[PDB]
Design a protein around this ligand. Structure first.
Ligand SMILES: Nc1ncnc2c1ncn2[C@@H]1O[C@H](COP(=O)(O)OP(=O)(O)OP(O)(O)=S)[C@@H](O)[C@H]1O
Ligand SMILES: Nc1ncnc2c1ncn2[C@@H]1O[C@H](COP(=O)(O)OP(=O)(O)OP(O)(O)=S)[C@@H](O)[C@H]1O
Ligand SMILES: Nc1ncnc2c1ncn2[C@@H]1O[C@H](COP(=O)(O)OP(=O)(O)OP(O)(O)=S)[C@@H](O)[C@H]1O
Ligand SMILES: Nc1ncnc2c1ncn2[C@@H]1O[C@H](COP(=O)(O)OP(=O)(O)OP(O)(O)=S)[C@@H](O)[C@H]1O
Lengths: 290, 283, 281, 289, 300, 295
């Protein structure tokens, strides 16, 4: 039984924060794609994700795959080679037990599509798959990307989110994509820039959140790691100022706990408390409790 | 067995709307091209002239679509272009590297001095003599030069002459290679409405089928279709910007559709233009 | 008795007219050539005019007016002496009369060996025969402009150095002292272009229709009508195909769907364009 | 498991300087084996990326870390079905023990060389894990020449001050793919050059200078012997000129020039190269008949 | 018997006007070349250096004329060639042509002269290296023996030399010419070293041009007087008209190559309706040339 | 039997004057190259990079080494460089080698003006020619010896900005060539680096006299078959030397001076009857005074 776009967006709220509009657009696009497949046809319903780095694009594509127990595989548009284009396919079969049908129900995420925008040979080569020649007609294609200059071209025609909403196929044309490639991506879902509160929730809520990991790394040391809310907010701010999105959270946390993890096993105390001054300033050492 | 110019123009009506004249011209020229290849370059002691095509129409008129359609209709290898020999190898990529079938192919050049002469060597052939070349282009200033000689845009583009293209910016040795000149006309408001309804793959039909497998009947009131037309003209996106309007109009409805139980959903003009009013729902 | 340049240009007006000034240069060039043989510059000729200006027709007419063996040759196509043997073929293999012959070389501007002939070396010598080298010279209109600082006024300022920068070598241009530039072509010469050539428009379409099982017939009135239509648009012969195609469009569109003997193109089909071609079953 | 202190302390006995990278390595290494000994969780990959000039001691550090933890070690060149060859070689020096081979360390040299600016994705399959390669620690070394430039075009002192401002995006623009960099969370950067490392360069490699010349002399019927003092001299000379490992041949050649000129015109058993020959350059290499 | 360089330059004065210095350089270059061939490549244990020539002068200066003249004066097989038409198998085509005008005699073909026009055109600023294979020497004939004269205007050469000598007129600057200047121009060192002898020509003058229209046995005036002569009409060129023609040629910078283009255009009308008249003679005045409006005087 | 580096440097003294240090380097470099091939390897490529001013004798050295080892030699200009044109150098090596695969693998290949392709298409050539240097007709380019001349103008500077002309070129380092415009993978293929010096007045003078084919000997012979004895006073030869140095044309700019000095003299020589012509410094430096004629 296929989950309604409601059940899909609902389950997406359990992994990705915000981007509600992008999760509605994806839910509908996904439901329509598998609803069209389970009825043997009689639109390709392929997807183009347009959002900043660390917005949750790749996470969304992987989540959709799990929620539908469907074989999923990634790929970078930078590593693209015509015989390497089918390599993505064999990888989908590898994680599909080499089942032709279940592999046709699969989802394929292509990262950094905005990077190959003239390169044009890759667009046309990968274009052969999107259409279909196992047949690649059945599988869903999700093309992520940051599209930097895109925010400019759209403005030259019409916040960053309000501008990305007025996105048009002609805008992607001027950006560097070819017509025949854009016509294969009818569904365009745009994600907004993550705020601070979302980032803080990413550091806490998820079952694999950074804090939980380090609290577990410090836990097997016999030490209790405590992240004060001020410290988490500081990390969020530290990440935004670097525009690294949620991808630049670990690079902050590691740098903050570096010294402490170094001379931790050579100490004997109860717990270590990380304050905001430890993050922002980076000068002050973390609180130590014996 | 080659499809008569009638059969070709007929199948072209199933994907492209209007431009009936451009379709006759394309149908004839295409028929003569492949009728020429099967018989041979030389026929009865006389050498037959290659009839390459030059599409002259506004952006989003259907030039690229036409070229594509013609290729599919004739199950012939097709490839676009905007390194000159790179186009050929690509034609070979989609042709299974078959030399013969790749000579029967069609090559569309979009947005048509050194490049003119470099691409000219292909048009002639060195083989690239066999393949058909369709050169698209909007030719903005062309509407002016023609007016300064002959003394709507369609009536003027009909008076197009090889000399007009010369003054435009093309070289004589390149234009002589494009005997067939097909001109597409300005799309009308009524034309757009027909694009949403008439074609066998028109938008309304796609969605009426998407909603249909939901057990729901989707009904587009003519007002809504006219609204979609205007909305598309104000954005100058032509026919390319139609889907972006329909999707946006039916976004909310498709979201919580499989979560309801009703007979049909009706899209009024208020749902398109205003975008504030939700589509009528009938249980 | 050799015809004075007057008589030569006068007879040239029966086959070609228009811009003039080349029929004079050619008349002078030609007169001097045979006035020099029957008794000193080589007096070879270089025709520089748009396609369909009547360069080819001009060359042939000159041959007929002087009852002299004529033969053409494409600059695009041991093969160099092939032109000679052909000149002997139309000359009854008469060495002397073949030396008085005229040779026209088309599309010279495209090649920017043959030089060895122009000079002169079968046993016949190529020093005696007159060489007329035609060509459109597209980029030539530009190089002249970048120096002197209508296309006709520019082609009048033509200089051997302009042909050099164009793509012609000095030793080859020095062999062609006489340089004639023509624009437009006479109505008659146009009619002959649609007929005479081995690749004439009517022959092509007559062959195109021929493989349909249909016989295409062009009435002289139609050919005349195509000629005028071409002059009114100043497109010359380059604007001939754009008339024929437009005249035979409808016919070729629903031709493969018919079953009839032949199709006849009257003048009413061309000029008026309203009346449909005569159809015979 | 040895504390990062004990680890950094033992690293000081084989490599000089680069204390910061040695801390970064001690922590990342400790956290990697501390995470394996507890079977993850009933956790980051903790993989390492070494960014330092050639001859800085990257390779040396990787080997030392392996010996200090009595863990199976194996190298590999990013320049050279062959991806799993490194694994079988790791099992070769591990007595084919699956478990002990999983706790092993793998050093990949010249990663900056494969930066497209397929191998990255192929090797990426291992970093993730499919014996499973998930358990083993990966240390990816490299000089990253153009890296010093891209960081400067973003941050806007010494190369060391710029390599400290290194960011994942800088590597992206350099030529590395996102999915590959995300696998190397730990980035340690070396500054100055290592002396003992250089000496190992002149000896250890299968194509080392001394080995090449000893052979050149060998086909002369002469045994070339390099005294460790001379090799040390050559290392120092290379550091003073900041030429690194690239400026070693230019030193050896210059040191063996006169010898090779009038060697074929002599008849003796072997030539010995002392430190006096190299540093002073005044004394001629000892000759034995 | 070989003509002393003097006899060579003297005979060069009968076909070329001015350019005395370059004629001197050629005379010596030519004399030594054949004086070298007859004696043999090697002379008295020492190997004599091949002295090929590089002519550097404006267009229509007389470069081609000098090369041809030298060839006739020594009754030696001559052949031209353009550096623009240059193809490695086409480089030997020049040789087969030399054999064609030499009755396929190997030895006499080796004594031949080969003029290469527009060398300055092939300056990259391959062919230089391909043609360089001939200059050195490798049908079975060897190209070592044949003398090579490489012509060329070298437009930009007048500039580079100025940017060097500075640390007068074009003539004074071309005199300061140096192999390194040709290097910077666009010629490869190995190619320039093959052209030791460098003769430069000066830009023609009015007085010279007028003598060009008169003195030579094939001067334009003599040709047209002959063309008019077989018409029964005597053509008279007034010195003023000849002067006018000179000036017209100078203003166009066409040199001596643009003289015929001036005479033809001046005598066009006259030659057109000449065979349709019956008079004694025609006299071309300056008014007929410069103004071009006035028709030539007609005498019955 | 391979000639010891001594014998090699010795025979190089008989064609090239000075450059002793470079000759030694080349002598070792060459001997090791053919000592390594003769034993079928088993080893460094032993490829050479000549760095000297124009007309110092780089090309001469390469040609002399070839002849001394009776080995097929061929040149090539880095300027004329096309990836399929690089193998043209090979077919040419086979042309002068009677198309013998083995002997063509023993050959020497000189590439002139390498300093010119330094990107400071150029880099593309370096990497293209680099494929040869490594080794891939059917002949392999791993066996043949590659010598790459070049003036390296700006090199004199970069070296100075580091060490802080001959004494500076001696301090040459592979990193200096890097900054110059050569890629690392290319320089690493040219381990041996011989540097030449700017020919001294005395060296130039010797060039005009000593060589069995010296200019003076040629002209003395050309004049000799005229029945005239040519005398070059040492002052004139030095005068010519200075003239060639001020122009920087190295030794390539010698003939261009002598021919110019003896122009007028050879013009009206066959038209005279005297014993001998004596060329004083005044004939060259002044250029104004005519040569001394003796009857
Ligand atoms: N909206 C979100 N809600 C919750 N977690 C998020 C969100 N966005 C990112 N993350 C987390 O932050 C990490 C960022 O990595 P990715 O999701 O791969 O970034 P990305 O934006 O998909 O990178 P791209 O688009 O391929 S350049 C992921 O592991 C997510 O778990
Ligand atoms: N006359 C028409 N009838 C039906 N659909 C059309 C028509 N014109 C355009 N379209 C559709 O709108 C889209 C516009 O893309 P194209 O057809 O490539 O436009 P185009 O005018 O060919 O663009 P150019 O000429 O390359 S700038 C196509 O995907 C067509 O499906
Ligand atoms: N110094 C001169 N004395 C007499 N007649 C000359 C002189 N220079 C040129 N002419 C004549 O003017 C004509 C000019 O043509 P050329 O001699 O071919 O010019 P050119 O300078 O040789 O052209 P190049 O060097 O090949 S670009 C020749 O036919 C000569 O007869
Ligand atoms: N050291 C030397 N001893 C004797 N003769 C020399 C010496 N150097 C140059 N020559 C002569 O002077 C001439 C100069 O030409 P080349 O040797 O080609 O100059 P080059 O320095 O090799 O030029 P490059 O390296 O290609 S820029 C040669 O013909 C040599 O015969």
């Amino acid at each position: 039984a296929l989950p309604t776009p409601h059940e899909i967006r609902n389950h997406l709220d359990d992994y990705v924060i915000g981007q509600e509009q992008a999760k509605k657009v994806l839910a509908v696009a996904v439901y329509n794609h598998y609803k069209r497949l389970r009825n043997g046809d009689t639109g390709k319903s392929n997807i183009l994700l347009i959002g900043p780095t660390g917005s949750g694009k790749t996470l969304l594509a992987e989540t959709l795959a799990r929620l539908l127990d469907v074989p999923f595989t990634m790929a970078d548009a930078t590593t693209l080679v015509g015989e390497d284009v089918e390599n993505i396919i064999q990888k989908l079969l590898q994680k599909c037990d080499y089942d032709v049908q279940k592999a046709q129900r699969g989802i394929v995420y292509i990262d950094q599509i905005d990077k190959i925008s003239r390169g044009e040979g890759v667009q046309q080569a990968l274009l052969k798959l999107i259409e279909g020649t196992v047949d690649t007609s059945k599988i869903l294609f999700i093309c992520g990307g940051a599209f930097a200059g895109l925010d400019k071209v759209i403005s030259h025609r019409v916040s960053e989110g309000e501008l990305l909403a007025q996105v048009e196929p002609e805008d992607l044309i001027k950006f560097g994509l070819i017509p025949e490639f854009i016509g294969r991506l009818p569904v365009v879902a745009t994600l907004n820039e993550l705020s601070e509160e979302a980032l803080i929730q990413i550091l806490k809520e998820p079952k694999n959140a950074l804090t939980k990991q380090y609290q577990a790394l410090f836990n097997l040391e016999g030490v209790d790691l405590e992240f004060r809310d001020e410290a988490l907010d500081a990390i969020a701010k530290k990440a935004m100022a670097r525009k690294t999105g949620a991808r630049g959270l670990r690079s902050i946390v590691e740098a903050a706990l570096l010294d402490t993890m170094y001379d931790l096993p050579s100490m004997e105390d109860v717990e270590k408390v990380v304050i905001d001054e430890s993050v922002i300033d980076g000068q002050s050492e973390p609180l130590l409790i014996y």
